[PDB]
């Protein structure tokens, strides 16, 4: 075995789902009953970039697909982007730290700090269609922590 990954679906604090629309972007909006399985499903896998009881390093990318999200500086400011990958190599441990996150999970609610940029988190606006993005502000106007449901 390479890396024990797992499929799941995240959904944020205000109940918004997580559907793709790019693949140059992701969005977080309310899915009607009859549209629920539009929401992307994630392949989360443990990379083990740095040990800590608090942080569990995890790289996650979209399953049945080749995308994996990673942080990069679009003009010296952290930006969330979807980089494609060789389906041959991945999933893999010790993954490039652009692709690495460390989930801070507490009582079933979990945040995702960036390894590349500490104190920068996967976030979402409270508006509806606005995209998922890397965020520098925690506990502000943008939603940082989500809740995941495992899937099959």
């Amino acid at each position: 075995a390479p890396v024990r990954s797992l499929n799941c679906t995240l959904r944020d604090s205000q109940q918004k789902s997580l559907v793709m629309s790019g693949p140059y972007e992701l969005k977080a909006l309310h899915l009607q009953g009859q549209d629920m399985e539009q929401q992307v499903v994630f392949s989360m896998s443990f990379v083990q970039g740095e040990e800590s009881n608090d942080k569990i390093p995890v790289a996650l990318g979209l399953k049945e697909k080749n995308l994996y999200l990673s942080c990069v500086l679009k003009d010296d400011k952290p930006t969330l982007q979807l980089e494609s990958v060789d389906p041959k190599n991945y999933p893999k441990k010790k993954m490039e730290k652009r692709f690495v996150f460390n989930k801070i999970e507490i009582n079933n609610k979990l945040e995702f700090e960036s390894a590349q940029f500490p104190n920068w988190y996967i976030s979402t606006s409270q508006a509806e269609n606005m995209p998922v993005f890397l965020g520098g502000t925690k506990g502000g106007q943008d939603i940082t922590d989500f809740t995941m449901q495992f899937v099959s």
Binding site: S13, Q14, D54, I104, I106, N107, G139, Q141, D142, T144
Partner: protein
């Protein structure tokens, strides 16, 4: 005169360019019961200060000019205070018989517009994921009449609070809808109000800290004496014995862990032994204490003799070791 040294370590700190309201210490010479302070005996309350200097001075207050230091009722009143006010202060009581003076260093603190300051901030525990909690602007009391309606805004960092995802300003109170770890940080309310044709500021800041719910306050859980890991040691193996214990969070919680040779703080007969004591805290402030035992050669009696790890915190717990 009955005289108490200044409250050196019980110090006061005040923001510049905005009203203070200092009280004279009556926790010494207690004197407050069944209708507060007694001026009836005719014990005049005298004020006077000295500044960072070498001399005492009568306190000018009437032509300040704006009664800027007028004491309205058995207590001092700066509207507004000024950096030059820093220094030690004194109040005393006079009866033809009675005298009593005491001092307290008043350090005036400059303020950044981002609320940066040397001022000590009060930590304010807040239970995690509770339904809804809130915080009131700390020390607004008595600064202004019920008649006037104040404007009052809040700020996390220099970040003003508006459209926050789970925090909401509600007049004097700040409400946290589902207190998450994301909510840690220094907060600061800033209340404005008009008085005699002027706007005074009151900025005060406290740091919110999210902690474990009482919803999950539970007796300590013993981990190490699990028995699935069996501690057997043939004669003279320098055996070690760790006792890791998880504590749920409570405020008046005195977490205690101790080994029990059989009920008397070890070291019976020779029995040379010593404890190593580690500790860890969750982000939530959930302690997890640990203890261990360095050991010499194992005397024949040790194995068949039982000893046990212990812990208690508003609840009590116990676990049996194995050899």
């Amino acid at each position: 005169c009955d005289d108490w040294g200044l409250d050196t370590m019980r110090q006061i700190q005040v923001f510049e360019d905005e009203p203070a309201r200092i009280k004279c210490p009556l926790f010494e010479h207690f004197l407050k019961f069944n209708y507060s302070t007694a001026h009836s005996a005719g014990l005049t309350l005298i004020w006077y200060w000295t500044r960072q200097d070498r001399d005492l001075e009568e306190p000018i207050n009437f032509r300040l000019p704006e009664n800027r230091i007028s004491k309205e009722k058995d207590v001092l009143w700066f509207r507004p205070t000024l950096l030059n006010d820093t220094g030690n202060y004194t109040c005393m009581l006079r009866n033809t018989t009675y005298c009593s003076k005491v001092a307290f260093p008043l350090e005036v603190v400059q303020k950044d517009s981002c609320f940066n300051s040397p001022m000590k901030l009060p930590v304010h525990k807040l239970y995690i994921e509770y339904g809804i909690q809130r915080i009131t602007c700390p020390n607004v009391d008595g600064y202004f009449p019920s008649s006037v309606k104040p404007t009052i805004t809040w700020y996390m960092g220099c970040y003003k609070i508006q459209n926050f995802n789970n925090v909401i300003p509600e007049g004097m109170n700040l409400s946290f809808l589902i207190a998450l770890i994301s909510n840690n940080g220094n907060y600061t309310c800033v209340v404005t109000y008009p008085e005699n044709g002027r706007t005074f500021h009151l900025t005060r800041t406290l740091t919110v800290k999210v902690v474990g719910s009482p919803k999950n306050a539970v007796p300590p859980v013993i981990h190490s004496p699990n028995d699935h890991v069996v501690y057997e040691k043939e004669p003279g193996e320098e055996l070690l014995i760790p006792c890791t214990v998880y504590f749920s969070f409570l405020m008046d919680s005195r977490n205690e862990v101790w080994w029990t040779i059989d009920g008397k703080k070890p070291d019976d007969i020779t029995i040379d032994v010593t404890i190593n004591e580690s500790i860890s805290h969750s982000r939530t402030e959930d302690e997890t204490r640990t203890q261990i035992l360095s050991i010499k050669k194992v005397t024949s009696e040790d194995l068949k003799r039982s000893y046990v790890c212990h812990a208690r915190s508003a609840k009590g717990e116990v676990a049996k070791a194995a050899k």
